[PDB]
């Protein structure tokens, strides 16, 4: 639309909230592929932060490419490597969700503030494979990664 289209050029950072992601229950529904920042360069944030971010974006885009195939084959017929991409992508998709201190009324959960180093560590670990045994739902609406581990432990105990 002309109004948002024109507004795009006046901003340094943008966070394009998406309805297709809010339907899935991932909140905040920030679209990871339609959001950008000016400082998002390796010389401003650091090479670790930049590489983690680009790895996350690439894995999500590969997931989108695979979703077209899964609509005809099915998850059961994917290359045992592609299933790994899908699993990592879903874990990363859920791990971006977070509970706010102002959305207590809706979710009922409790707000979490995640320091930057903890987010970078969490996503770097999720990509590196250090969690490819925990189920997806363990990562849904939690702060740092250790909270996902604890939630998975609780899920297993009350299994």
């Amino acid at each position: 639309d002309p109004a948002p289209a024109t507004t795009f050029a006046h901003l340094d950072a943008t966070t394009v909230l998406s309805r297709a992601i809010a339907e899935l229950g991932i909140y905040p529904a920030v679209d990871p592929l339609d959001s950008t920042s000016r400082i998002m360069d390796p010389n401003i944030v650091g090479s670790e932060h930049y590489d983690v971010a680009r790895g996350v974006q690439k894995i999500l885009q590969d997931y989108k490419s695979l979703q077209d195939i899964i609509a005809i084959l099915g998850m059961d017929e994917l290359s045992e490597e592609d299933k790994l991409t899908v699993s990592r992508a879903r874990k990363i998709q859920r791990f971006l969700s977070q509970p706010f201190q102002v959305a207590e009324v809706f979710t009922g959960h409790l707000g979490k503030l995640v320091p930057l180093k903890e987010t970078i560590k969490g996503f770097q670990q999720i990509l590196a494979g250090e969690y490819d045994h925990l189920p997806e739902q363990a990562f849904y609406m939690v702060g740092p990664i250790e909270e996902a581990v604890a939630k998975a432990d609780k899920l297993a105990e009350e299994h």
Binding site: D68, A71, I72, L73, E77
Partner: protein, 272 residues
């Protein structure tokens, strides 16, 4: 619909067509390989069947225990393969149980199990999955025969239903009788065969069971890959027709939207 609805639908169908073309090519390659492998297996299995059609064996008419094995696969998108197999399997099971028998069922491949899990859900002696991912070998047939013999349902008669591969476009559903040594021993024809105790004959029956399972597996995989190739070709053709229709609709809608916006601008300009 509106222009964005049409655009999204058109993009989705284009992706679907691309995927179905790629799947056709993959299925064609696998079909070529499976046919190449089927020739030697064809001769081998026909030779293994040789005896029962050389020394005609009539199954006993005083026994009730029967086995139905149905070879298919786990993969879908192969047209009327699993459907035909399961249809004939339930036909045979109904005929046997109406004539008064105690039928069981072995399903080589999920899709047979699924088609028959509503009715005949309790006759499953045992079912095998993980079929179709890689071409079947003699290891698979040996495993199936071993888990059939071990599962102590000593049957009195058997049948195997598979899709015999006729031509690249056509296949037929067969029923190949499987006999137990209780029938082979009690056959006048077998009186001639020399050095035929009831132990060498038992080993021979086990081996022939493995042989027939392997033959059915090779024929079934060949026909399944051919059917998947044909199904993907038809699906891609249908997606192409739908893409043509939707492209025509999209062009109409795009022109209509341009004209509508322009008329709005003109009316506003002239209405000052």
């Amino acid at each position: 619909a509106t222009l964005k609805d049409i655009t999204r639908r058109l993009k989705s169908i284009k992706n679907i067509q691309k995927i179905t073309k790629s799947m056709k090519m993959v299925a064609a390659a696998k079909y070529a390989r499976a046919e190449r492998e089927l020739k030697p297996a064809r001769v081998y299995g026909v030779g293994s069947l040789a005896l029962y059609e050389k020394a005609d064996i009539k199954t006993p008419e005083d026994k009730k225990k029967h086995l139905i094995i149905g070879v298919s696969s786990d993969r879908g998108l192969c047209g009327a393969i699993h459907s035909s197999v399961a249809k004939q399997m339930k036909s045979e099971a109904a005929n046997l149980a109406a004539a008064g028998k105690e039928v069981k069922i072995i399903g080589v491949g999920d899709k047979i199990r699924s088609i028959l899990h509503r009715t005949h859900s309790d006759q499953f002696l045992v079912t095998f999955k993980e079929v179709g991912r890689r071409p079947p070998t003699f290891g698979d047939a040996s495993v199936i025969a071993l888990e059939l013999l071990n599962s102590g349902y000593e049957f009195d008669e058997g049948s195997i239903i598979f899709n015999r591969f006729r031509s690249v476009i056509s296949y037929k559903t067969e029923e190949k009788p499987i006999f137990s040594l209780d029938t082979i021993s009690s056959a006048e024809s077998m009186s001639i065969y020399d050095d035929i105790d009831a132990d060498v004959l038992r080993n021979y029956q086990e081996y022939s069971l493995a042989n027939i399972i392997y033959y059915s597996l090779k024929e079934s995989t060949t026909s399944e890959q051919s059917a998947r190739m044909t199904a993907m070709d038809n699906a891609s053709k249908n997606a192409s027709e739908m893409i043509d229709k939707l492209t025509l609709t999209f062009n109409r809608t795009r022109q209509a939207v341009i004209t509508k916006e322009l008329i709005e601008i003109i009316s506003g300009a002239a209405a000052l």
